[PDB]
Design a protein around this nucleic acid. Structure first.
Ligand SMILES: [Mg+2]
Ligand SMILES: [Mg+2]
Ligand SMILES: [Mg+2]
Ligand SMILES: [Mg+2]
Ligand SMILES: [Mg+2]
Ligand SMILES: [Mg+2]
Ligand SMILES: [Mg+2]
Ligand SMILES: [Mg+2]
Ligand SMILES: [Mg+2]
Ligand SMILES: [Mg+2]
Ligand SMILES: [Mg+2]
Ligand SMILES: [Mg+2]
Ligand SMILES: [Mg+2]
Ligand SMILES: [Mg+2]
Ligand SMILES: [Mg+2]
Ligand SMILES: [Mg+2]
Ligand SMILES: [Mg+2]
Ligand SMILES: [Mg+2]
Ligand SMILES: [Mg+2]
Ligand SMILES: [Mg+2]
Ligand SMILES: [Mg+2]
Ligand SMILES: [Mg+2]
Ligand SMILES: [Mg+2]
Ligand SMILES: [Mg+2]
Ligand SMILES: [Mg+2]
Ligand SMILES: [Mg+2]
Ligand SMILES: [Mg+2]
Ligand SMILES: [Mg+2]
Ligand SMILES: [Mg+2]
Ligand SMILES: [Mg+2]
Ligand SMILES: [Mg+2]
Ligand SMILES: [Mg+2]
Ligand SMILES: [Mg+2]
Ligand SMILES: [Mg+2]
Ligand SMILES: [Mg+2]
Ligand SMILES: [Mg+2]
Ligand SMILES: [Mg+2]
Ligand SMILES: [Mg+2]
Ligand SMILES: [Mg+2]
Ligand SMILES: [Mg+2]
Ligand SMILES: [Mg+2]
Ligand SMILES: [Mg+2]
Ligand SMILES: [Mg+2]
Ligand SMILES: [Mg+2]
Ligand SMILES: [Mg+2]
Ligand SMILES: [Mg+2]
Ligand SMILES: [Mg+2]
Ligand SMILES: [Mg+2]
Ligand SMILES: [Mg+2]
Ligand SMILES: [Mg+2]
Ligand SMILES: [Mg+2]
Ligand SMILES: [Mg+2]
Ligand SMILES: [Mg+2]
Ligand SMILES: [Mg+2]
Ligand SMILES: [Mg+2]
Ligand SMILES: [Mg+2]
Ligand SMILES: [Mg+2]
Ligand SMILES: [Mg+2]
Ligand SMILES: [Mg+2]
Ligand SMILES: [Mg+2]
Ligand SMILES: [Mg+2]
Ligand SMILES: [Mg+2]
Ligand SMILES: [Mg+2]
Ligand SMILES: [Mg+2]
Ligand SMILES: [Mg+2]
Ligand SMILES: [Mg+2]
Ligand SMILES: [Mg+2]
Ligand SMILES: [Mg+2]
Ligand SMILES: [Mg+2]
Ligand SMILES: [Mg+2]
Ligand SMILES: [Mg+2]
Ligand SMILES: [Mg+2]
Ligand SMILES: [Mg+2]
Ligand SMILES: [Mg+2]
Ligand SMILES: [Mg+2]
Ligand SMILES: [Mg+2]
Ligand SMILES: [Mg+2]
Ligand SMILES: [Mg+2]
Ligand SMILES: [Mg+2]
Ligand SMILES: [Mg+2]
Ligand SMILES: [Mg+2]
Ligand SMILES: [Mg+2]
Ligand SMILES: [Mg+2]
Ligand SMILES: [Mg+2]
Ligand SMILES: [Mg+2]
Ligand SMILES: [Mg+2]
Ligand SMILES: [Mg+2]
Ligand SMILES: [Mg+2]
Ligand SMILES: [Mg+2]
Ligand SMILES: [Mg+2]
Ligand SMILES: [Mg+2]
Ligand SMILES: [Mg+2]
Ligand SMILES: [Mg+2]
Ligand SMILES: [Mg+2]
Ligand SMILES: [Mg+2]
Ligand SMILES: [Mg+2]
Ligand SMILES: [Mg+2]
Ligand SMILES: [Mg+2]
Ligand SMILES: [Mg+2]
Ligand SMILES: [Mg+2]
Ligand SMILES: [Mg+2]
Ligand SMILES: [Mg+2]
Ligand SMILES: [Mg+2]
Ligand SMILES: [Mg+2]
Ligand SMILES: [Mg+2]
Ligand SMILES: [Mg+2]
Ligand SMILES: [Mg+2]
Ligand SMILES: [Mg+2]
Ligand SMILES: [Mg+2]
Ligand SMILES: [Mg+2]
Ligand SMILES: [Mg+2]
Ligand SMILES: [Mg+2]
Ligand SMILES: [Mg+2]
Ligand SMILES: [Mg+2]
Ligand SMILES: [Mg+2]
Ligand SMILES: [Mg+2]
Ligand SMILES: [Mg+2]
Ligand SMILES: [Mg+2]
Ligand SMILES: [Mg+2]
Ligand SMILES: [Mg+2]
Ligand SMILES: [Mg+2]
Ligand SMILES: [Mg+2]
Ligand SMILES: [Mg+2]
Ligand SMILES: [Mg+2]
Ligand SMILES: [Mg+2]
Ligand SMILES: [Mg+2]
Ligand SMILES: [Mg+2]
Ligand SMILES: [Mg+2]
Ligand SMILES: [Mg+2]
Ligand SMILES: [Mg+2]
Ligand SMILES: [Mg+2]
Ligand SMILES: [Mg+2]
Ligand SMILES: [Mg+2]
Ligand SMILES: [Mg+2]
Ligand SMILES: [Mg+2]
Ligand SMILES: [Mg+2]
Ligand SMILES: [Mg+2]
Ligand SMILES: [Mg+2]
Ligand SMILES: [Mg+2]
Ligand SMILES: [Mg+2]
Ligand SMILES: [Mg+2]
Ligand SMILES: [Mg+2]
Ligand SMILES: [Mg+2]
Ligand SMILES: [Mg+2]
Ligand SMILES: [Mg+2]
Ligand SMILES: [Mg+2]
Ligand SMILES: [Mg+2]
Ligand SMILES: [Mg+2]
Ligand SMILES: [Mg+2]
Ligand SMILES: [Mg+2]
Ligand SMILES: [Mg+2]
Ligand SMILES: [Mg+2]
Ligand SMILES: [Mg+2]
Ligand SMILES: [Mg+2]
Ligand SMILES: [Mg+2]
Ligand SMILES: [Mg+2]
Ligand SMILES: [Mg+2]
Ligand SMILES: [Mg+2]
Ligand SMILES: [Mg+2]
Ligand SMILES: [Mg+2]
Ligand SMILES: [Mg+2]
Ligand SMILES: [Mg+2]
Ligand SMILES: [Mg+2]
Ligand SMILES: [Mg+2]
Ligand SMILES: [Mg+2]
Ligand SMILES: [Mg+2]
Ligand SMILES: [Mg+2]
Ligand SMILES: [Mg+2]
Ligand SMILES: [Mg+2]
Ligand SMILES: [Mg+2]
Lengths: 63, 156, 124
RNA sequence: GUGUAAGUGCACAAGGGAGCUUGACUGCGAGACGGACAUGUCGAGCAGGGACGAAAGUCGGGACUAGUGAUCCGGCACCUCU
RNA sequence: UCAACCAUAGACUCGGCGAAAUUGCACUACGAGUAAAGAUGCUCGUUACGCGCGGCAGGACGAAAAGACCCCGGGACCUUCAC
RNA sequence: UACACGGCCCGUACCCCAAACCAACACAGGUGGUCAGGUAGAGAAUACUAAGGCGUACGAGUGAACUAUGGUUAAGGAACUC
RNA sequence: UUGUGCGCCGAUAAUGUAGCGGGGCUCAAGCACACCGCCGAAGCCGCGGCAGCCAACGUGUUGGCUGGGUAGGGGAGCGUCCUGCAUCCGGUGAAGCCGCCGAGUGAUCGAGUGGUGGAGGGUGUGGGAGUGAGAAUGCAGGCAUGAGUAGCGAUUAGGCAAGUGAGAACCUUGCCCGCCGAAAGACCAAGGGUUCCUGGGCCAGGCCAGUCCGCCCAGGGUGAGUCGGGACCUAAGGCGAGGCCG
RNA sequence: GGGGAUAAGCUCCGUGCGUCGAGAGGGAAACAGCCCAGAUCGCCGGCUAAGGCCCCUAAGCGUGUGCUAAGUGGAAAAGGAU
RNA sequence: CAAACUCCGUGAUAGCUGGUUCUCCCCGAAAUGCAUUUAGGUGCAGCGUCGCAUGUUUCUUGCCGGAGGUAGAGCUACUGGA
RNA sequence: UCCGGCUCUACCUGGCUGGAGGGCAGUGAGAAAAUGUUGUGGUUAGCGGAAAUGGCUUGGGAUGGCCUGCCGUAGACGGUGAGAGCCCGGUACGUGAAAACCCGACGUCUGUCUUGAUGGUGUUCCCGAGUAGCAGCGGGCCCGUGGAAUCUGCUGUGAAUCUGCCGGGACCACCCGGUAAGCCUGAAUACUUCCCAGUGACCGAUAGCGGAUUAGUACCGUGAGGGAAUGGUGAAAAGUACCCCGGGAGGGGAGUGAAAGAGUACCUGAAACCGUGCGCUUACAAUCCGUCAGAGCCCUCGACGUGUCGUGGGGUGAUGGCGUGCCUUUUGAAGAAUGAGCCUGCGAGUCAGGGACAUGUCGCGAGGUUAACCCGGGUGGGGUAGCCGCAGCGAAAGCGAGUCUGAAUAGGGCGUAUCCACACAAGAGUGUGUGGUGUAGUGGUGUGUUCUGGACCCGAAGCGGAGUGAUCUACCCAUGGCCAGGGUGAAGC
RNA sequence: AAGUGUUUAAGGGCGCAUGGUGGAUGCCUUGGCACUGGGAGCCGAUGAAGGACGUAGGAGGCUGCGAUAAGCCUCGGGGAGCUGUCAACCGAGCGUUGAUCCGAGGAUGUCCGAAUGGGGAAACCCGGCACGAGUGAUGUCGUGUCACCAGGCGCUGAAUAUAUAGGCGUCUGGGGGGAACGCGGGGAAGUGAAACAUCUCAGUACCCGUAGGAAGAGAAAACAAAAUGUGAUUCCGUGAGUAGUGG
């Protein structure tokens, strides 16, 4: 039983070069009118996941 | 529990019986039932890197040499005559150790087929020389052909 | 390699039974319930292994009080005078003497009384 | 008294009037605040252009704190992506 | 009211065969108090020679059934303009 | 019609309202058809009897409670009790 | 009048004082204020022992400290079975069983033994595990207690003589008594299949003994052209060539 | 502190609160949660905390100075009383 | 019998209940917040442990710089209330 | 090569079929049927097959202990009175089948064809049709209508035949590549009810198949079906002659045997459990049944006389201090909360994967390692197919110690392993340039965790598929039987 | 006179020695489990798989065997011992010419059982046809043959005129059983999704029809991607949990 990965996550993250996992910013898909650009401005451009949840996710990607 | 034969039914009603609640005539706690964790046919091979085995052989042989349990010989038994008595006389004259290991060129069949009987002596062509036999044997002896071929294989 | 579970279990069965040797009724017969009182009796052993010192010191003190009163003095005064004289003998030896050599006990009580200051109610 | 409750502030105005006009800009963002986490808040300075004021400077939405919705699936426009 | 007597088969004793539920322990009293909040088992004090046999059932929260009721994670069956 | 010939195989014991069948038992249960005496009586009820078979496998002894099956009861007669 | 410390009444429950723990306590053993004392723990100190961490020096000693502990984490081990081995232990007694002794902080150990047992175990160092039981109303087996207690299975019911026999209420024979008698009698079908008879014995079975039995052991026993099932025919219904449909 | 009635062994919060949980020892008779105090092991040694010193039970029926007659001590109020 | 019985999928599935076996040595929790078809489940952060790293950055007190807006107090000071 | 007959007849040129001769091969998937047989190949069963009475000792019994000598191309294995190569079955090795059967060739006999074949210059009805494809409907390919190819098919439809087709992951053009609708064909592979021979860090009777034994039996259920428990005397039966008690059973002697505390209920015989006897305790005693003290009595041992001391013991324990079992789940239980009658056996974090990670630890090191597989009755050697890191950034194009963002030196995000010394800035904490120290991962082995597997163990109400039942009951169908006696008195007459 | 005081055990408890029941423990294996290398991959109308009944000198049971009944022939291997077992025992007996034992071919094979002559509650009833035999004849006896379906052949031919269906009779096949594997027709839920329909569970279990020792698939209307490449099917390890698919 070769360890199943999680195709629902690989479509959402990527492994950095030092072991961290990069995640993309959420809360932008729709209803953008009353979101001001300044709010969105730090909202585009991916970011690494927090050292808190990385533990679970790391167990998720390579599964 | 899945393979034990028979009675795949509830032994008795759930409530009102006053006994323990059971769910199979073959539960692992019942007598004559299955085993909690049934083993299956199985292999125990462990893969050891080629460098692992080569280094182990080098170390074992180095220790044996430091112990002085190696020799050399041009031939062991006279040709066209497998005679355990001749082999025993030769070995008794040569070594006072009961059990020894000998390495020969594969093609020499008389020696092997003659001295194979004894339990304290072993013969191995050096294609099949192995760590366990080397360790078990008190001493080892390398025929000329076997020593030459093995050394050349080492140096090649 | 299935291992049949006979000798190991019997060893500890017998060891517990032996350690329980001499208890009441079935309590020296049934392992399943000898264990109960092996464990208990040894818990009592642990506790009283110190309770005994307290009890024995109590008995010694009682004997000393009796001897002092028979010699016309109260135990606390005997102790006070003895300390004030700076003696280093303890109540075990006190009791053993008091029951063995009344003459020596009398001498000791005289020493204590003499070492006893003049006034006992002095605030100093 | 101060658009919509209460509190906090507010006359050096955050209160009205007018004139003009769009910064309710564009890309970033030193560093922080709060967040278990996703998020959420504040922010000097840097490049183009513009706004008001001669200038000094202020201008990245409303005096602040509520007015909000993750992900998927889909629709629409532009691009030197395949 | 208000039970009385009597003839029957048991209950009783003797001989014969010989069960079951239950069962952590057992050199197993009382009361007031205490306490997981109604104690044979803790505290205090009272009473009590060891042991039986026939009876009576107040307690031993007695025995029987992993509570029906209520609620909580779930089943089956049934109803309907629930999907 | 004189005639001497010729007609299979299988069941046939026993029990069969019961210690033999169906009920786990040598169990106060169930089990279909046939035979149907005498005296009283309408009688196939009931009571006693022949034919015939049974006393169905623990006994012996003890005026207690108390329980069960029964008999009798002064006077009252439903006052108990739903 | 006032401020004061003590007091009194104000004050009734239920199994038995039962609202100092009790006895008892005012000639306080009560209350308030000071003093000296003394008891009082696993607290501390005293003596001996073990272990962890730490520092110094060395090639494991000195000194400072800490050592209760569930869920849980970490470290180090004991023992069982079976593999590898230098190979040994043992009919001059293995394993196993039951004792005794001594030793380790523990799981234990003993080239440690006494009695049974009479054929296999195995030092050391690794290796692999169906590897360690009190619980799960666990499973299977054995044995407990309630206990020599309840029950001995009806409404018909016996006593006795004699016989057999070791034993005789219970069986055989005899006499009387009672009970059924639209059965508790006599035949069958269905069903059961040797329970029928004779002979022998009574461990086991019969809810007791039992010579008896529907026990067991051996033997014997079932005789049909005319009774019954097939040779015959058919109902309900089943099967069904071809056939139809799937 | 909120709620409840300033009732509950009540419920809901805060305590770089404490303790039990996950804590043995002594005291309050008994009593985790109140008081004193952290059980490496052994010792038939000594000093002490809380609480106690007439007997059950170890320790003063102690010292000196006052109060109480109620067994108050050893359950309670408004109020009343030479 | 509110969907017969035997076998099989079947080790159905059980956030639920029970049970979980040899010794010692060291450290030592929480019953919190947030979220949750979530409230008796689960995950994240705090709380423990082991290792590695920074080796005092941590702790206690004294002094210094600080902002409060509670207890209390006050009201011809405001909002109320007399 | 030749001969004849034809394209409705006879006489040059062109297009076919039949016969005499090199082929194609054949028990064949591409022609069909027949024609017959040699391997010391094997199978079915077999033959020989070495070498101590060796001696002594304990020993019942020797294979055992000691001493000699033994043979071995055989020291796998089993048995015989205890451990046997020199005792027997047998082992290497050799040998062998009258007869039959499975696998390998070789001279009777059979077919064909050489009317057929091979190489060279230009113009004019065949090679798989109800098929490909299509509309709708669904199915299988990882592909759930999604933008959906390819395949199959249910219904209606429906093609071209070479400048034909269909595919190249909606779809089209140039070109690029392979022939559908007909057919068959070994080897590699899966399985083992059956047989033989060998092996096991597989079990050793509650294990192991349910079943070492009359077992799928007894027994249960009418059925489908379910489904047991039950091994060992001894080396050999030598299984207890005979005597005695009793009716026998049973038992005690005598004998057998090494042992009868091996006697057929038979090796070992434990614990619960029930007894006998012995020492001590107990009939004024209130209770998790012990522990701490502790006299007395009993016995034991040494110095010492009749019993007293002595670094005294074991057994008992009069009496007194403390003392509320165990596991659970719980905030909390002596608990009157749960579970346990007792004993003995059995019973629960295992196991697989180039699975993933981290920690130990082992080898090599900018390298690390191989899978499957091939060949050594043996783990060796070969096999670099592959995977991880050596470089990351970006979604991607692409760039590359930088890269993304962006119009951007203009810093930010992520890496450049990580640092030391020199200079430039602000000292917005650090950033920006030089010279060196130069990067550490990978594959075992064991371990915790995660992963999918039933995944720590037992347990449900229930859902689904296949079968067995109307011998009770419900209903009904056909054929028979049953209803003592006594009254009431319709219609009708 | 006074007060002081052991002196017994119906039983009980504790130890100690003895035993009794119950059969764990230790040791044993003809038994099982799992494999390796080989063999064989079917058995059946010449009557199978599996059964009833019978069969012995001896009563039952197991094993073998089949009225020719622990068996019979022929050929080859061995011998001085045999007449299987419970079980022994006897009793009868068998052998140097070679009996039994083992192997090869052969015959024998009752009855039920696809059952096949018809029927039927398995191991039991009832017949037709051809040839022989015995009785005064019959009665009676044996032996054989007698199913269905499929495919052919010969004969016949209804509606009817041709012909066909149907009707006969004869040869050759098949019929049932068997552990798994393979193909093919059909084909679900528990469960996971923490519920649940899509989805998953899975084309799995199970049912059914086929053959075989293997099967199936099998000679591109396949891939690939400018290389002037691969070249049937099948099975392994990769490629890879990657491209993708998915409330
Ligand atoms: Mg994926
Ligand atoms: Mg968008
Ligand atoms: Mg806007
Ligand atoms: Mg965390
Ligand atoms: Mg079991
Ligand atoms: Mg098993
Ligand atoms: Mg005692
Ligand atoms: Mg403004
Ligand atoms: Mg204004
Ligand atoms: Mg920043
Ligand atoms: Mg500018
Ligand atoms: Mg600005
Ligand atoms: Mg703004
Ligand atoms: Mg603004
Ligand atoms: Mg969605
Ligand atoms: Mg009355
Ligand atoms: Mg009577
Ligand atoms: Mg009575
Ligand atoms: Mg009575
Ligand atoms: Mg009785
Ligand atoms: Mg109370
Ligand atoms: Mg109590
Ligand atoms: Mg009470
Ligand atoms: Mg009584
Ligand atoms: Mg009570
Ligand atoms: Mg009650
Ligand atoms: Mg109850
Ligand atoms: Mg319920
Ligand atoms: Mg529910
Ligand atoms: Mg249902
Ligand atoms: Mg006639
Ligand atoms: Mg007949
Ligand atoms: Mg008859
Ligand atoms: Mg009869
Ligand atoms: Mg009768
Ligand atoms: Mg019966
Ligand atoms: Mg009866
Ligand atoms: Mg009856
Ligand atoms: Mg009737
Ligand atoms: Mg009648
Ligand atoms: Mg009568
Ligand atoms: Mg009669
Ligand atoms: Mg009565
Ligand atoms: Mg009465
Ligand atoms: Mg009367
Ligand atoms: Mg009256
Ligand atoms: Mg005054
Ligand atoms: Mg008063
Ligand atoms: Mg008091
Ligand atoms: Mg003091
Ligand atoms: Mg102390
Ligand atoms: Mg201390
Ligand atoms: Mg130190
Ligand atoms: Mg500790
Ligand atoms: Mg807890
Ligand atoms: Mg723990
Ligand atoms: Mg051991
Ligand atoms: Mg011996
Ligand atoms: Mg011995
Ligand atoms: Mg011994
Ligand atoms: Mg022996
Ligand atoms: Mg051993
Ligand atoms: Mg080892
Ligand atoms: Mg080891
Ligand atoms: Mg286990
Ligand atoms: Mg046990
Ligand atoms: Mg436990
Ligand atoms: Mg248990
Ligand atoms: Mg019960
Ligand atoms: Mg009982
Ligand atoms: Mg009675
Ligand atoms: Mg009675
Ligand atoms: Mg009866
Ligand atoms: Mg008699
Ligand atoms: Mg009558
Ligand atoms: Mg009648
Ligand atoms: Mg009559
Ligand atoms: Mg019948
Ligand atoms: Mg019959
Ligand atoms: Mg009879
Ligand atoms: Mg007889
Ligand atoms: Mg008898
Ligand atoms: Mg009996
Ligand atoms: Mg008989
Ligand atoms: Mg038909
Ligand atoms: Mg408070
Ligand atoms: Mg509460
Ligand atoms: Mg604590
Ligand atoms: Mg405490
Ligand atoms: Mg206390
Ligand atoms: Mg301590
Ligand atoms: Mg007391
Ligand atoms: Mg005192
Ligand atoms: Mg004082
Ligand atoms: Mg005084
Ligand atoms: Mg005074
Ligand atoms: Mg009071
Ligand atoms: Mg008062
Ligand atoms: Mg007043
Ligand atoms: Mg049923
Ligand atoms: Mg199955
Ligand atoms: Mg399933
Ligand atoms: Mg289950
Ligand atoms: Mg589950
Ligand atoms: Mg529970
Ligand atoms: Mg600690
Ligand atoms: Mg510092
Ligand atoms: Mg201030
Ligand atoms: Mg205030
Ligand atoms: Mg004021
Ligand atoms: Mg105001
Ligand atoms: Mg031979
Ligand atoms: Mg000898
Ligand atoms: Mg020898
Ligand atoms: Mg030897
Ligand atoms: Mg050998
Ligand atoms: Mg041997
Ligand atoms: Mg031999
Ligand atoms: Mg799709
Ligand atoms: Mg498509
Ligand atoms: Mg083509
Ligand atoms: Mg094809
Ligand atoms: Mg192949
Ligand atoms: Mg055994
Ligand atoms: Mg049945
Ligand atoms: Mg003898
Ligand atoms: Mg026995
Ligand atoms: Mg024995
Ligand atoms: Mg006693
Ligand atoms: Mg007394
Ligand atoms: Mg008392
Ligand atoms: Mg007690
Ligand atoms: Mg106590
Ligand atoms: Mg007490
Ligand atoms: Mg709790
Ligand atoms: Mg507790
Ligand atoms: Mg109780
Ligand atoms: Mg409980
Ligand atoms: Mg309860
Ligand atoms: Mg509960
Ligand atoms: Mg219970
Ligand atoms: Mg029981
Ligand atoms: Mg892994
Ligand atoms: Mg590593
Ligand atoms: Mg390396
Ligand atoms: Mg290799
Ligand atoms: Mg990228
Ligand atoms: Mg951009
Ligand atoms: Mg830059
Ligand atoms: Mg491993
Ligand atoms: Mg089903
Ligand atoms: Mg039926
Ligand atoms: Mg009329
Ligand atoms: Mg037979
Ligand atoms: Mg022959
Ligand atoms: Mg033959
Ligand atoms: Mg043959
Ligand atoms: Mg024949
Ligand atoms: Mg037929
Ligand atoms: Mg037939
Ligand atoms: Mg035909
Ligand atoms: Mg015609
Ligand atoms: Mg066939
Ligand atoms: Mg799901
Ligand atoms: Mg769910
Ligand atoms: Mg599904
Ligand atoms: Mg699928
Ligand atoms: Mg074939
Ligand atoms: Mg093919
Ligand atoms: Mg791949």
């Amino acid at each position: 039983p070769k360890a199943k990965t999680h195709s629902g996550a690989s479509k959402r993250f990527r492994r950095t070069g030092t072991g961290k996992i990069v995640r993309q910013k959420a809360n932008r898909r729709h209803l953008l009118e009353h979101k001001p650009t300044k709010r969105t401005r730090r909202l585009d451009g991916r970011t690494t996941v927090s050292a808190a949840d990385n533990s679970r996710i790391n167990k998720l990607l390579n599964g | 529990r899945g393979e034990v034969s028979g009675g795949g039914k509830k032994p008795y009603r759930q409530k009102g019986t006053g006994r323990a609640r059971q769910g199979s005539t073959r539960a692992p706690q019942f007598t004559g039932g299955g085993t909690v964790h049934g083993p299956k046919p199985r292999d125990y091979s462990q893969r050891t890197p080629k460098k692992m085995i080569a280094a182990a052989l080098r170390g074992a042989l180095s220790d044996r040499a430091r112990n002085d349990r190696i020799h050399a010989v041009t031939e062991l038994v006279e040709g066209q005559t497998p005679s355990t008595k001749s082999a025993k006389t030769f070995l008794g004259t040569l070594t006072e150790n009961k059990k020894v290991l000998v390495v020969i060129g594969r093609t020499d069949e008389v020696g092997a087929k003659s001295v194979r009987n004894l339990p304290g002596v072993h013969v191995i062509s050096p294609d099949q020389l192995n760590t366990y036999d080397v360790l078990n044997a008190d001493d080892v002896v390398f025929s000329v052909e076997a020593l030459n071929a093995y050394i050349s294989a080492n140096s090649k | 390699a299935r291992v049949k579970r006979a000798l190991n279990a019997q060893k500890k069965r017998r060891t517990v039974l032996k350690a329980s040797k001499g208890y009441r009724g079935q309590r020296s017969r049934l392992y399943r319930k000898a264990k109960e009182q092996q464990l208990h009796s040894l818990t009592y052993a642990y506790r009283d292994r110190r309770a005994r010192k307290g009890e024995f010191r109590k008995l010694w003190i009682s004997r000393i009080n009796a001897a002092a009163r028979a010699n016309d003095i109260t135990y606390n005064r005997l102790i006070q005078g003895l300390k004030a004289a700076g003696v280093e003998v303890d109540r075990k030896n006190l009791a053993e003497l008091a029951v063995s050599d009344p003459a020596a006990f009398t001498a000791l009580v005289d020493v204590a009384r003499a070492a006893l200051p003049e006034d006992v109610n002095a605030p100093s």
